[PDB]
Amino acid sequence: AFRPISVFREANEDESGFTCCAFSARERFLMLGTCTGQLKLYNVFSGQEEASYNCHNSAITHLEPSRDGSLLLTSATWSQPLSALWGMKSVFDMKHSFTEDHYVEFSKHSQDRVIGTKGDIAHIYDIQTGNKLLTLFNPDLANNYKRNCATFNPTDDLVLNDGVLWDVRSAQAIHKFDKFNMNISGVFHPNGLEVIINTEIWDLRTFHLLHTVPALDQCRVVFNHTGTVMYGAMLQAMKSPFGSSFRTFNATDYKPIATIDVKRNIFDLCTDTKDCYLAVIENQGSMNMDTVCRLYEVG
């Protein structure tokens, strides 16, 4: 079950502008991006704001804190630069920026690199220097996915970009997964064995199709930390990225668990490092922007 535990809005604002969320390394603190480009730290139980920082001059679309707690990636919708890396030690400061990338993630095993996406192109950057190490794009294998996001695999040896599997070491495309949809480019299963590209589950070894999961169509997905549950929400074709529902799946067999209809448009969802909690950003109005963060205890 998901027990509603708490709800809160952007403190002292006429209209609440939370757009995205991620749990900090610190257990009871949630980081939230806003529609005006600020990063906020909230106590997720009290709903009280602790800290605010100015990151971009447009809405934050994505946040990702590093596991050690020292770094943060942000992306914005219509700012220059579009994405940035922030230090969060003593002073909150911009380390580096990724001017043309509308989406960024850290490498997974060792978080020493950033991977940014621009359209169907992946850029890989060194965290220390900020230098672009690699541009990944192959005109012969491109799928031209409209909502492409590039990502590392769990051991950082591989990248999936626009439905193409890359060997990072050699910077060579090693396989193109055939295209079944217009938008979604796919992610790696944390088990390191499978690639989830929209409704298709591919075996990484053989490149054979393992399953078709229709309910995943047009979904962004996130896994809990233990890799046992997958959350998916369907993209809509300052508007909300998602519709009013998200779905859970058993990550070990891809069997559905629950379909949760929150009856309001969803902006984001994240889970805490202990997989005890789910945070969901939902609009109380309809595109009126007045979002709340709802916190559920995961049963």
Ligand X SMILES: N#CC[C@H](NC(=O)c1c[nH]c(/C=C/C(=O)N2CCCCC2)c1-c1ccc(Cl)cc1F)c1ccc(F)c(Cl)c1
Region binding ligand X by CB under 6 A among candidate stretches 45-53, 125-133, 197-205, 217-225: 217-225
Task: Name the CA dihedral angle for 165, 107, 136, 242, rounded to a multiple of 10 degrees.
Answer: 80
Span 38-77, contacts to ligand X by CB under 6 A: 59, 61-62, 77
Kindly state the greatest CA–CA separation across the chain.
Answer: 55
At CA 109, angle to CA 105 and CA 113, rounded to 5?
Answer: 45
| CA 98/CA 150 separation, integer angstroms | 14
Does the footprint of ligand X cover residue 147 (CB under 6 A)? yes
The token pair at 35 is 């529609």
| CA 130/CA 109 separation, integer angstroms | 19
Report in angstroms how near the CB of residue 81 gets to ligand X at its nearest.
16
Region binding ligand X by CB under 6 A among candidate stretches 46-54, 85-93, 108-116, 267-275: 267-275
Nearer to ligand X, 35 or 142 (CB): 35
Report in angstroms how near the CB of residue 219 gets to ligand X at its nearest.
7
Nearer to ligand X, 203 or 261 (CB): 261
| CA 148/CA 280 separation, integer angstroms | 23
The token pair at 119 is 């359209």
Among residues 101, 268, 272, 282, the one that binds ligand X under rule CB under 6 A: 268
Report in angstroms how near the CB of residue 237 gets to ligand X at its nearest.
12
Among residues 56, 108, 123, 220, the one that binds ligand X under rule CB under 6 A: 220
Does the footprint of ligand X cover residue 150 (CB under 6 A)? no
Does the footprint of ligand X cover residue 269 (CB under 6 A)? yes
Q: Which long-range contacts (CB under 8 A, 24 or more apart) does 194-201 make?
A: 195/160, 195/165, 196/221, 197/160, 197/163, 201/254
Q: Where are the alpha helices (DSSP H) in the chain?
A: none
Does the footprint of ligand X cover residue 233 (CB under 6 A)? yes
Does the footprint of ligand X cover residue 18 (CB under 6 A)? no
| CA 257/CA 127 separation, integer angstroms | 38
The token pair at 69 is 């707690």
The token pair at 198 is 């929209």
Does the footprint of ligand X cover residue 245 (CB under 6 A)? no
Does the footprint of ligand X cover residue 127 (CB under 6 A)? no
Residue nearest to ligand X (CB): 233
Please work out the total of residues on this chain that contact ligand X, with binding judged by CB under 6 A: 25
Q: Enumerate residues 6+ apart whose C-beta is below 8 A from 211.
A: 200, 201, 254
Nearer to ligand X, 235 or 276 (CB): 235
Q: In what order do the strands lie in the sheet containing 38-43?
A: 18-23, 29-34, 38-43, 49-54
The amino acid sitting at 154 is: P
Does the footprint of ligand X cover residue 246 (CB under 6 A)? yes
Does the footprint of ligand X cover residue 231 (CB under 6 A)? yes
Does the footprint of ligand X cover residue 149 (CB under 6 A)? yes
Q: Render the burial of 53-62: b for 16+ CB within 10 Å, e for the rest.
A: bebbebbbbb
Nearer to ligand X, 5 or 235 (CB): 235
Among residues 196, 201, 213, 221, the one that binds ligand X under rule CB under 6 A: 221
Judged by the rule CB under 6 A, the positions of this chain that interact with ligand X are 19-20, 35, 59, 61-62, 77, 103, 147, 149, 220-222, 231-233, 235, 238, 241-242, 246, 266-269
